[model samples]
Target: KAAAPACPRFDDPVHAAADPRVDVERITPDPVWRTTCGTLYRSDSRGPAVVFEQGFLPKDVIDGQYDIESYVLVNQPSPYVSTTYDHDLYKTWYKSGYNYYIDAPGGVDVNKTIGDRHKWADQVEVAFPGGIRTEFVIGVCPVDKKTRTEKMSECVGNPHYEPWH
Candidate 1:
């Protein structure tokens, strides 16, 4: 049998504001989905697959309003329990842009855990202004034909980081 097709390479410019295959919008504050796009890496690869400034609110507007935490993982499928760190790198990415996303070779799966269901796959959470919450899952698994993996790095702290804005 032929090998399973690899995730598509995103070298071609992304013209859409939200490519259903990889774009995630309006993620909640739940610890499970809460992630720094910069810390995420392709399996067995160094650096992020996609790095962006994502949080409960916009960067300039999110300051001191909520306690935010970030995590990183490489060569692993899940971000909840995996370990990967590059503080200096993450800081640099943050300074350059307030929001960005890497189009990883292997598509990303963002989910939340529930009772009796550890690492509930393809799930999302929603929160109210004062803390009420809800969950929804938007699975984003896009096919890749190149069968090759690449690393993504962005200096978030750089003054020119907001180029996408």
Candidate 2:
């Protein structure tokens, strides 16, 4: 009986409102990210740092009982090269969306970092039991980064990856 986990307890509340490492931003859903990724399931090249507002989902989930935990999974997939001409490159954009189970504790904005790229996948799951959850697909390219000038309608690689950099 000598195995206390090295990290914080599961039920402990997180107070990362001012935690810089979390990269928390309370944006009003304006078009930030001068650079965007994927012509399909596009994510701001600044990483899929998305924020869901209080009413973004249903009321039962937002202000539910003590044991009602809903989940929000954002998947960012790896690159795939599928082409007849050259067997070239692609992000398998359709399969590129990542997954999660976040709906963490006490707050209006649940900052769920959706992938392995974050503080070593250290997520902020705002959990509370709710009915059948909502799943999503985010468009990402074969992994390249382009300027913000292009419309988010087409497939473009994540600039951070720098053309598979």
Candidate 3:
């Protein structure tokens, strides 16, 4: 249920984002399941859609991560369909990956171009480690089609993110 990733014609990219931090707030990201050869668009190849290293990646990556392709919309989904895709596997269940899935009550799409590439939609969001947030579907298979030990196997487990990790 995915296929789109092919962007880079932003006369505005919806909003350009020269950001230093002053976002009026939009939040609406969620398109992880890439595997059509990781959907091309590498720019240079980084993690979580690389909007300029999302959160100062390095400590293996996702060092306080958030802005997952602009704004964590990982409400979760990907239950087996020959795709691949993560990064501690998104920090052992969305650890440093902050932002925590907000701005989704119908706000984004000012024209669409925060990260552009769309269509691989499947709903994602899984902040575990005890933070408590739910919903995910990623069935694991990115042993090489992607990043972070293939997300450590899309994150070791999905205890519902503890009750999901």
Candidate 4:
């Protein structure tokens, strides 16, 4: 049969933590962005790169053993756009304030590059469409080592998709 897929390396120039890519200071100090349950979520324009974190739903939300929590970096900020797949569904969810946030790693500060295993520390939540409010917590960081080398997916309890990367 086919061999297990190899994990891909990330060389994202836009979202990578560095001098010009993303300013850790600006991100942490922004009043528009706040932390909840240790996760950070944003609601304003902060230059070019911005990080947003997401978590999966409970077993009642989805059906699976391993759930996933991920982050998506939008190079440019828009008001509040829904996810590509379920725009309407996301729109509905966002309105209720189903916001998201991630916890900082044990040793990392509020705004620093979390180690490879703790990348979820950079997760941020965005205000949903129509301005509804919800609270979400960052569970685990999920990456697709094989196919998706760019962004991470939102967490789901029982998932049909494979949780890799």
Most lDDT-accurate candidate: 4
Global Cα lDDT for candidate 3:
0.23
Q: What is the full ranking by TM-score, best candidate first?
A: 3, 4, 1, 2
Q: Give a tens-digit lDDT track for model 1, residues 76-144.
A: 221121211222222222222222222211122233322223342212211112110011111112212
Q: Write the per-residue lDDT of candidate 3 for residues 67-116, one digit (tens) a residue.
A: 44422334222111111122223323322232121110111221132333
Q: For candidate 2, lDDT tens digit of each residue in 44-91?
A: 222233322111122232222222111233322211100111111122
Cα deviation of 134, candidate 4, in Å: 21
Residue 57 of candidate 3: its Cα lDDT? 16
Each prediction's RMSD to truth:
18.3, 17.0, 15.3, 17.6
Which residue runs does candidate 2 get wrong by more than 4 Å? Answer: 1-5, 12-142, 145-165
Q: What is the C-alpha lDDT of each candidate?
A: 0.22, 0.23, 0.23, 0.24
TM-score, prediction 4: 0.18
Error of 1 at 3 (Å): 40
Clashing pairs counted in every model: 23, 30, 18, 20
How does model 1 fare in lDDT? 0.22
The stretch of ten residues in a row with the least summed lDDT in candidate 4 is: 58-67
Distance (Å) between predicted and true CA of 30, model 3?
A: 17
